[PDB]
Amino acid sequence: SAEKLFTPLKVGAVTAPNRVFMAPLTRLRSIEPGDIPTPLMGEYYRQRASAGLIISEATQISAQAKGYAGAPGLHSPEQIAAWKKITAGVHAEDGRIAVQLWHTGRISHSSIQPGGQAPVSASALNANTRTSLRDENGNAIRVDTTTPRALELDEIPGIVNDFRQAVANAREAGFDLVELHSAHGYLLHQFLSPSSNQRTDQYGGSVENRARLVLEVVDAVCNEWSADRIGIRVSPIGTFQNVDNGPNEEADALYLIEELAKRGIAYLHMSETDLAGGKPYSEAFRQKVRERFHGVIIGAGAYTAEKAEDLIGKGLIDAVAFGRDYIANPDLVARLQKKAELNPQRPESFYGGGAEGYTDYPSL
Ligand SMILES: Cc1cc2nc3c(=O)[nH]c(=O)nc-3n(C[C@H](O)[C@H](O)[C@H](O)COP(=O)(O)O)c2cc1C
């Protein structure tokens, strides 16, 4: 029963009974055509309802936002109807669930874009990585990303509106909170990073300009619903999927965080490392972040329970989001509380497929 990991925490409009959160995890098992959540996905989330808070797999705010075959959306009536069943399942088990909303930007492929056209981004620069599509048999396959088209200035308001509309849809779908995906090299992060943003208008250049889009989105969704329903995920230190954070990452991160604090949003979710190597956050930096944000702070990235307890005990973060351990342990909370062994992970089934390696992992 660790120490503080199993104590309640007020997270915006809801109250988590523990600080063991389920990180957003793309599993690519949605129905196509339609990018529709499935009953299987509903079962998967229901099995993990004991989490202090479940943060859903990244979900499209629009069809244009799609970058992976199998990722769900929250823009169509069918998607809203399917998500409604999933959130109800989680609530039936007394859990809480937030929907992570994204626009993949340049991490996409023309074959899954509307009209088969090139994807969009801050600038016309290829992501230089491989996204996941589906072959003729419906199996996940890695394919090089398509070079994007730079969004025209007059197209930006539309992007902001898509985020706003998706949040309105999330409210109807029964989600408890929404998490804006402003990390890991996706659209919002593409604007935030100098490496992927070479714009010469007000959306490029200074950190103020680079953060303009994400802050416009934050304001739009706070106005649409309520600030205490809004969370945001950032990965401001280091490099993620080829997108770094510039030569002044620390200062730029604090600027963004101070701006986010002004909106009084529910939480700040910090993704500290990418799947590969990554420089550890200094306690000094954590302190700088803590004193600038007055909401819940969630730490994530190869966390150990011990590390979570250490940082929560030091008053630097409030909760921890576990990714892969949640894939393999539906009842991770109980296991960590009883200090029980965990099920082994099967990475081969992280993406695509069906029930195997998804609803496959037993609870105690
Ligand atoms: C299979 C897989 C899918 C992921 N999908 C997402 C996602 O959709 N959105 C996101 O922000 N991060 C995503 N991540 C990152 C996780 O949220 C988490 O931060 C990461 O797994 C590192 O923590 P861990 O060591 O506890 O797994 C993904 C990671 C994995 C392994």
Ligand SMILES: C[C@]12C=CC(=O)C=C1CC[C@@H]1[C@@H]2C(=O)C[C@@]2(C)[C@H]1CC[C@]2(O)/C(O)=C/O
């Ligand atoms: C975890 C991840 C990272 C951050 C995020 O927000 C969402 C995801 C889900 C998809 C993952 C992605 C990666 O880290 C890169 C992967 C693993 C991709 C699927 C195929 C992939 O693009 C890879 O094979 C390219 O090398």
